[PDB]
C-alpha cells in the first residue's frame, strides 16, 4: 500500500472537519450533503431555531432544507419518518450503558404524551431510548428539556459514533469483571463534547458502534462492534484488549478482529480518538455499502490500520495485545429477568420483560414510579429491549411482585418472550419490508401455546436487510421479505436464519430457508424447536 494512500483526506476548518478539495471526486450523495452544509451547525450554531419555524411543505420545496430535515437532523438525533409517518420525527438519545433516571423517564413520557396516537417509545438493540411523534416546531423546546434533565440526543444517527453499550449489570453483579459505566460515560462525553457537540468525530465515512465489556456473559456483544474493549490484565496492569471492525449490513456481516493492541484503563478515550481519527482521515467515501471501518481494515490490512492508530496515540505508543483476557470462556449466559441479589448486601435488582421493547407514556410513568418507590430512581435498558430496576431493598421484593403493572411487564414471562427481540419495522420505518413488532408477538405467543421448552432460545425479528435486530446473532432469526402464497398473491414473509451464537463462543447465523410466508411460520418454528432445541408438544 502506497504512502499516498495514508494522506489524511479531511481537514479542520473553522471548528468543523471537511473533505479536502482533492478528495471530493466520486463521493456518495451523503458526503455531498455534508459538504453542502455542516450538519453540526444545526445544534452548535443553533441553526435549528430558524429551521423549525419553516412549515414542512415549504421545507420540502428546496434541496438544502429537505436535506436538513431528512439527513442533517440525524446529527441531532432526529429521524424524519417521511414515508410512514410524514412530518413526524423519531428522536434517539445517547444513553451510555443503558442507564436512565425516573426524572428522565417522566420527561420522555411527557413529550410523547403530547402526540397522542402518534406518540410512543421504544427500547433499542443498543440499550437506548427512542421517542416518537415529534413535530419540527417543538424541536427547540425538546432539546432544551432534554438538556435540563441531563440527556442528549447528539450524534446518534448517520455518520456518527452510536450509543456506547456496556454491561447492564454494571456495578451490581457479584460476578462482574469491571464496572463499565465510568468507561461508557467517558466515551459518550468524548463523542458528544460533553453534550455541546464534537465535530472532530461527527464527519466519519459511516456509522461506528462501540462497546465496553464488563461481563463474562458478554452481554455487550463485542463481536459485532466497530470497537470492543475486552478487559485484560497485561504485565500486572488492568486494561483492555481491542477488537475492531465488527459490523452488520445488507451486503456483508463480519465479526470484530483483534487489533493486536492493549491499552491501560486510562487510555480508553485516547485510543477511541485515535481509531476514529484514522477512520475519519482515511476511510473510503464512495459506495455507502463499502464505507464501514472493516473495509478500511481490509484495504490497509490490520497491521497497516494498527500503524495508523499508533501514530495517533499520545507519544505514539500502542502496546500489543495481552496473551489472555479476563473473560472466562467457561460460562453460561445468565438470565437477568426476575429478582437477583446484588453484590451490595441486602439489595436486589429486578429484570422486567418489555414486550418487543414498546411502551406508551402511561407505562413509562409507571416504570418511573416503581424505580422511585422500590429502587433508587434508576431504570436500566438492555439490548434485548428489556429493563432492569436496580438497588431495591430485598425486603421490598414481596410487595413489588404484587404490583399490577408486573402483570404486563413481567419478571418471569414465558421463555420464548425472554429472548424475543424485534426492530421497529414498517409501523414507522420507511426501509421496512414487513411489520415486525406486532407480528413477532403474535407468532411467538402461538408457538409457545403449542410447545414447552427449557433451552433459552433467542428469536430476533428484523424488517429489512439492514438487520438492526441482529438476526445473525439469533438462534432463530426472521428477516422481512415479500413472498407469495399458494395462489401467487403477494404476502409478507421472512427469510429464516439459524446458527447464531453469542457469548465467548460466538458465531454468525445464516439463511436456512428463504421466503416463508409469515402466515406459515408457526408450524415451521414449532418443528424447529422440537427438532433442534428440545421442545415438547403440549
Ligand atoms: C431502533 C433500532 C432498531 C430497534 O428496534 O432497536 C434501529 C433502527 C433503524 N436503523 Fe439500525 N437500528 C438499531 C440498531 C442497529 C444495529 C444493531 C447494533 O447496533 O448492534 C445494526 C446492525 C449492526 C451494525 O450497524 O453494524 C443496525 C443497522 C442499520 C443499518 C445498516 C448499516 C450498514 O452498514 O449498512 C442502517 C442503514 C444505514 O445506516 O445506512 C440502519 C438504519 C436505521 C434507521 C435509522 C433507518 C431509517 O432512518 O429509518 C432505523 C430507524 C427506524 C425507527 O424509526 O426506529 N441501521 N441498526 C436500533 C437503534 C440503536 C440505537 O439506539 O442507536
Ligand atoms: S432492520 Fe430495516 S425495518 Fe428494521 S428498523 Fe432497521 S432499517 Fe427499519
Ligand atoms: Cl441513520
Ligand atoms: Cl422514511
Ligand atoms: K423485550
TrEMBL record:
The keyword Ligase does not apply. PROSITE patterns: NIR_SIR. One of its GO terms (molecular function) is 4 iron, 4 sulfur cluster binding. It comes from the Eukaryota. Its cofactor is [4Fe-4S] cluster; siroheme. It comes from Nicotiana tabacum (Common tobacco). The gene is nii3. It catalyses: 6 oxidized [2Fe-2S]-[ferredoxin] + NH4(+) + 2 H2O = nitrite + 6 reduced [2Fe-2S]-[ferredoxin] + 8 H(+). Residues 81-149, 340-404 form the Nitrite/Sulfite reductase ferredoxin-like domain. Residues 158-316, 420-527 form the Nitrite/sulphite reductase 4Fe-4S domain. Its EC number is 1.7.7.1. InterPro entries: NIR_SIR_4Fe-4S, NiRdtase/SiRdtase_haem-b_fer, Nit/Sulf_reduc_fer-like_dom_sf, NO2/SO3_Rdtase_4Fe4S_dom, NO2/SO3_Rdtase_4Fe4S_sf, NO2/SO3_Rdtase_FeS/sirohaem_BS. Belongs to the nitrite and sulfite reductase 4Fe-4S domain family. Keywords: 4Fe-4S, Heme, Iron, Iron-sulfur, Metal-binding, Nitrate assimilation, Oxidoreductase. Siroheme binds at residues 81, 124-126, 128, 130, 132, 206-207, 209, 248, 289, 292, 385, 424, 429, 468, 470. Pathway: Nitrogen metabolism; nitrate reduction (assimilation). It is an enzyme of class 1 (oxidoreductase). One of its GO terms (biological process) is nitrate assimilation. The keyword Iron-sulfur applies. [4Fe-4S] cluster binds at residues 423, 429, 464, 468. This is Ferredoxin--nitrite reductase, chloroplastic.
Amino acid at each position: 500500500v502506497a504512502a499516498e494512500r495514508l494522506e489524511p483526506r479531511v481537514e479542520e476548518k473553522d471548528g468543523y472537519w471537511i473533505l479536502k478539495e482533492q478528495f471530493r471526486k466520486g463521493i456518495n450523495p451523503q458526503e455531498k450533503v455534508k459538504i453542502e452544509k455542516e450538519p453540526m451547525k444545526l445544534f452548535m450554531e443553533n441553526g435549528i431555531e430558524e429551521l423549525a419555524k419553516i412549515p414542512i411543505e415549504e421545507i420540502d420545496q428546496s434541496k438544502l432544507t429537505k436535506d436538513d430535515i431528512d439527513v442533517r437532523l440525524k446529527w441531532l438525533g432526529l429521524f424524519h419518518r417521511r414515508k410512514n409517518q410524514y412530518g413526524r420525527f423519531m428522536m434517539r438519545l445517547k444513553l451510555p450503558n443503558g442507564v436512565t433516571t425516573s426524572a428522565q423517564t417522566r420527561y420522555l413520557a411527557s413529550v410523547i404524551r403530547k402526540y397522542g396516537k402518534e406518540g410512543c417509545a421504544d427500547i433499542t438493540t443498543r440499550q437506548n431510548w427512542q421517542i416518537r411523534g415529534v413535530v419540527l416546531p417543538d424541536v427547540p423546546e425538546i432539546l432544551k428539556g432534554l438538556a435540563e434533565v441531563g440527556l442528549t440526543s447528539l450524534q446518534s444517527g448517520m455518520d456518527n459514533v452510536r450509543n456506547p453499550v456496556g454491561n447492564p449489570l454494571a456495578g451490581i453483579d457479584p460476578e462482574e469483571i469491571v464496572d463499565t459505566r465510568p468507561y461508557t460515560n467517558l466515551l459518550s462525553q468524548f463523542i458528544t463534547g460533553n453534550s455541546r457537540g464534537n465535530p472532530a468525530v461527527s464527519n466519519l465515512p459511516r456509522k461506528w458502534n462501540p462497546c465496553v465489556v464488563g461481563s463474562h456473559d458478554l452481554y455487550e456483544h463485542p463481536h459485532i462492534n466497530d470497537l470492543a474493549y475486552m478487559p485484560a490484565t497485561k504485565d500486572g496492569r488492568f486494561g483492555f484488549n481491542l477488537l475492531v471492525g465488527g459490523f452488520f449490513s445488507a451486503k456483508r456481516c463480519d465479526e470484530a478482529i483483534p487489533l493486536d493492541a492493549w491499552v491501560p484503563a486510562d487510555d480508553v478515550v485516547p485510543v477511541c480518538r485515535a481509531i476514529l481519527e484514522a477512520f475519519r482521515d482515511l476511510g473510503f467515501r464512495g459506495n455507502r455499502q463499502k464505507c464501514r471501518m472493516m473495509w478500511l481494515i481490509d484495504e490497509l490490512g490490520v497491521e497497516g490500520f494498527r500503524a495508523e492508530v499508533e501514530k495517533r496515540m499520545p507519544q505514539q505508543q500502542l502496546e500489543r495485545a495481552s496473551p489472555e483476557d479476563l473473560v472466562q470462556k467457561q460460562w453460561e449466559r445468565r438470565d437477568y429477568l426476575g429478582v437477583h441479589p446484588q453484590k451490595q448486601e441486602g439489595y436486589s435488582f429486578i429484570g422486567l420483560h418489555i414486550p418487543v421493547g414498546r411502551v406508551q407514556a402511561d407505562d413509562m410513568d409507571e416504570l418511573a414510579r416503581l424505580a422511585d418507590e422500590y429502587g433508587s430512581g434508576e431504570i436500566r435498558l438492555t439490548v434485548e429491549q428489556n429493563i432492569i430496576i436496580p438497588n431495591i431493598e430485598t425486603s421490598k421484593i414481596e410487595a413489588l411482585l404484587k404490583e399490577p403493572v408486573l402483570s404486563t411487564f413481567s419478571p418471569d414471562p414465558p421463555i420464548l418472550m425472554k429472548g424475543l427481540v424485534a426492530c421497529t419495522g414498517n409501523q414507522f420505518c420507511g426501509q421496512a419490508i414487513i411489520e415486525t413488532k406486532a407480528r413477532s408477538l403474535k407468532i411467538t405467543e402461538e408457538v409457545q401455546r403449542q410447545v414447552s421448552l427449557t433451552k433459552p432460545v433467542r428469536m430476533h425479528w428484523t424488517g429489512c436487510p439492514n438487520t438492526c435486530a441482529q438476526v445473525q446473532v439469533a438462534d432463530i432469526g426472521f428477516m422481512g421479505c415479500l413472498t407469495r402464497d399458494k395462489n401467487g398473491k403477494t404476502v409478507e414473509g421472512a427469510d429464516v436464519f439459524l446458527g447464531g451464537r453469542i457469548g465467548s463462543d460466538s458465531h454468525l447465523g445464516e439463511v436456512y430457508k428463504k421466503a416463508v410466508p409469515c402466515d406459515d411460520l408457526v408450524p415451521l418454528v414449532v418443528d424447529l424447536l422440537v427438532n433442534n432445541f428440545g421442545a415438547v408438544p403440549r
